[PDB]
Amino acid sequence: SHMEQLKCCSGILKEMFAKKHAAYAWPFYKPVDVEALGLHDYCDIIKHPMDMSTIKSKLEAREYRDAQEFGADVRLMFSNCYKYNPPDHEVVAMARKLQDVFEMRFAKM
Ligand SMILES: Cn1cc(-c2ccccc2Oc2ccccc2)c2cc[nH]c2c1=O
Protein backbone atom coordinates (compact mmCIF):
# COMPACT_ATOMS: atom_id res chain seq x y z
CA SER A 1 0.00 0.00 0.00
CA HIS A 2 1.24 3.51 -0.97
CA MET A 3 -0.56 5.20 2.00
CA GLU A 4 1.04 2.80 4.57
CA GLN A 5 4.42 3.35 2.77
CA LEU A 6 4.18 7.17 3.18
CA LYS A 7 3.19 6.92 6.91
CA CYS A 8 6.35 4.81 7.44
CA CYS A 9 8.34 7.48 5.48
CA SER A 10 7.02 10.18 7.91
CA GLY A 11 8.05 7.88 10.80
CA ILE A 12 11.60 7.41 9.39
CA LEU A 13 12.05 11.21 9.01
CA LYS A 14 10.67 11.72 12.58
CA GLU A 15 13.50 9.48 13.97
CA MET A 16 16.12 11.34 11.85
CA PHE A 17 14.88 14.58 13.57
CA ALA A 18 14.99 12.89 17.03
CA LYS A 19 17.37 13.85 19.90
CA LYS A 20 18.98 10.34 19.67
CA HIS A 21 20.64 11.27 16.30
CA ALA A 22 20.85 15.11 16.87
CA ALA A 23 24.71 15.13 17.24
CA TYR A 24 25.21 14.18 13.53
CA ALA A 25 21.80 14.97 11.92
CA TRP A 26 21.66 18.74 12.75
CA PRO A 27 23.53 19.97 9.51
CA PHE A 28 20.70 18.33 7.45
CA TYR A 29 17.78 19.85 9.40
CA LYS A 30 17.43 23.04 7.30
CA PRO A 31 18.43 24.14 3.74
CA VAL A 32 22.18 24.83 3.30
CA ASP A 33 22.78 28.57 3.94
CA VAL A 34 24.48 29.53 0.63
CA GLU A 35 25.13 33.11 1.99
CA ALA A 36 27.35 31.67 4.81
CA LEU A 37 31.19 31.85 4.57
CA GLY A 38 32.80 29.09 2.47
CA LEU A 39 29.46 28.27 0.74
CA HIS A 40 29.80 30.82 -2.16
CA ASP A 41 30.32 27.98 -4.69
CA TYR A 42 27.54 25.69 -3.26
CA CYS A 43 24.97 26.69 -5.97
CA ASP A 44 27.58 26.15 -8.77
CA ILE A 45 28.21 22.52 -7.66
CA ILE A 46 24.77 21.59 -6.19
CA LYS A 47 21.96 22.00 -8.75
CA HIS A 48 19.23 20.28 -6.67
CA PRO A 49 19.56 21.17 -2.93
CA MET A 50 17.64 19.12 -0.33
CA ASP A 51 17.33 18.99 3.46
CA MET A 52 15.10 17.29 6.04
CA SER A 53 12.75 20.32 6.54
CA THR A 54 12.08 20.46 2.75
CA ILE A 55 11.42 16.65 2.79
CA LYS A 56 9.04 17.04 5.82
CA SER A 57 7.11 19.76 3.89
CA LYS A 58 7.09 17.65 0.68
CA LEU A 59 5.47 14.71 2.60
CA GLU A 60 2.89 17.10 4.23
CA ALA A 61 2.10 18.64 0.77
CA ARG A 62 1.76 15.03 -0.63
CA GLU A 63 4.51 15.72 -3.23
CA TYR A 64 5.69 12.04 -3.02
CA ARG A 65 3.68 9.34 -4.87
CA ASP A 66 5.43 6.51 -2.95
CA ALA A 67 8.36 5.47 -0.66
CA GLN A 68 10.83 5.41 -3.61
CA GLU A 69 10.17 9.15 -4.32
CA PHE A 70 10.71 10.08 -0.61
CA GLY A 71 13.80 7.78 -0.63
CA ALA A 72 15.19 9.55 -3.72
CA ASP A 73 14.97 12.98 -1.93
CA VAL A 74 16.67 11.62 1.25
CA ARG A 75 19.49 10.17 -0.91
CA LEU A 76 19.72 13.43 -2.90
CA MET A 77 20.42 15.21 0.45
CA PHE A 78 23.25 12.71 1.20
CA SER A 79 24.66 12.70 -2.36
CA ASN A 80 24.75 16.55 -2.38
CA CYS A 81 26.84 16.37 0.80
CA TYR A 82 29.26 13.76 -0.66
CA LYS A 83 29.53 15.71 -3.96
CA TYR A 84 30.16 19.20 -2.48
CA ASN A 85 32.43 18.46 0.52
CA PRO A 86 35.97 16.94 0.59
CA PRO A 87 35.94 13.21 1.62
CA ASP A 88 37.69 14.07 4.96
CA HIS A 89 35.18 16.83 5.98
CA GLU A 90 33.42 16.43 9.39
CA VAL A 91 29.94 16.80 7.72
CA VAL A 92 30.67 13.81 5.36
CA ALA A 93 31.20 11.52 8.43
CA MET A 94 27.94 12.89 9.92
CA ALA A 95 26.11 12.26 6.58
CA ARG A 96 27.28 8.59 6.67
CA LYS A 97 26.07 8.21 10.29
CA LEU A 98 22.60 9.63 9.44
CA GLN A 99 22.50 7.61 6.18
CA ASP A 100 23.13 4.38 8.21
CA VAL A 101 19.98 5.26 10.24
CA PHE A 102 17.89 5.99 7.11
CA GLU A 103 19.11 2.93 5.08
CA MET A 104 18.41 0.40 7.90
CA ARG A 105 14.88 1.87 8.45
CA PHE A 106 14.12 2.27 4.69
CA ALA A 107 15.19 -1.36 3.99
CA LYS A 108 13.16 -2.88 6.89
CA MET A 109 9.77 -1.57 5.58
C1 LIG B 1 24.73 19.43 4.43
N1 LIG B 1 25.79 20.36 4.72
C2 LIG B 1 25.63 21.13 5.86
C3 LIG B 1 26.54 22.04 6.24
C4 LIG B 1 26.31 22.80 7.46
C5 LIG B 1 25.25 23.69 7.51
C6 LIG B 1 25.05 24.46 8.65
C7 LIG B 1 25.91 24.34 9.72
C8 LIG B 1 26.97 23.45 9.67
C9 LIG B 1 27.17 22.68 8.54
O1 LIG B 1 28.22 21.78 8.41
C10 LIG B 1 29.08 21.54 9.47
C11 LIG B 1 30.20 22.34 9.62
C12 LIG B 1 31.07 22.08 10.66
C13 LIG B 1 30.83 21.01 11.51
C14 LIG B 1 29.73 20.21 11.33
C15 LIG B 1 28.84 20.47 10.30
C16 LIG B 1 27.69 22.20 5.43
C17 LIG B 1 28.81 23.05 5.55
C18 LIG B 1 29.63 22.77 4.48
N2 LIG B 1 29.01 21.80 3.74
C19 LIG B 1 27.83 21.43 4.31
C20 LIG B 1 26.89 20.45 3.87
O2 LIG B 1 27.08 19.79 2.86
Swiss-Prot record:
JQ1, a thieno-triazolo-1,4-diazepine derivative, and I-BET, a benzodiazepine derivative, have been tested on tumors with success. Treatment with GSK1210151A (I-BET151, a I-BET derivative) has strong effets on mixed lineage leukemia and promotes myeloid differentiation and leukemia stem-cell depletion. It is linked to Cornelia de Lange syndrome 6: A form of Cornelia de Lange syndrome, a clinically heterogeneous developmental disorder associated with malformations affecting multiple systems. It is characterized by facial dysmorphisms, abnormal hands and feet, growth delay, cognitive retardation, hirsutism, gastroesophageal dysfunction and cardiac, ophthalmologic and genitourinary anomalies. CDLS6 inheritance is autosomal dominant. This is Bromodomain-containing protein 4. It is found in: Nucleus; Chromosome. The chain holds residues 352 to 457 of 1362 of the full protein. Residues 4-109 form the Bromo domain. The NET domain mediates interaction with a number of chromatin proteins involved in transcription regulation (NSD3, JMJD6, CHD4, GLTSCR1 and ATAD5). The C-terminal (CTD) region mediates interaction and recruitment of CDK9 and CCNT1 subunits of the P-TEFb complex. It is also required for maintenance of higher-order chromatin structure. Chromatin reader protein that recognizes and binds acetylated histones and plays a key role in transmission of epigenetic memory across cell divisions and transcription regulation. Remains associated with acetylated chromatin throughout the entire cell cycle and provides epigenetic memory for postmitotic G1 gene transcription by preserving acetylated chromatin status and maintaining high-order chromatin structure. During interphase, plays a key role in regulating the transcription of signal-inducible genes by associating with the P-TEFb complex and recruiting it to promoters. Ubiquitously expressed. Coiled coil: none annotated. The record marks 85 as: Acetylated histone binding. Interacts with p53/TP53; the interaction is direct. Interacts (via CTD region) with CDK9 and CCNT1, acting as an associated component of P-TEFb complex. Interacts with RELA (when acetylated at 'Lys-310'). Interacts (via NET domain) with NSD3, CHD4, BICRA and ATAD5. The interaction with BICRA bridges BRD4 to the GBAF complex. Interacts (via NET domain) with JMJD6 (via JmjC and N-terminal domains); the interaction is stronger in presence of ssRNA and recruits JMJD6 on distal enhancers. Interacts with NSD3. Interacts with NIPBL. (Microbial infection) Interacts with bovine papillomavirus type 1 regulatory protein E2. This interactions may serve for the tethering of viral genomes to host mitotic chromosomes allowing successful partitioning of the viral genome during cell division. Phosphorylation by CK2 disrupt the intramolecular binding between the bromo domain 2 and the NPS region and promotes binding between the NPS and the BID regions, leading to activate the protein and promote binding to acetylated histones. In absence of phosphorylation, BRD4 does not localize to p53/TP53 target gene promoters, phosphorylation promoting recruitment to p53/TP53 target promoters. Belongs to the BET family.
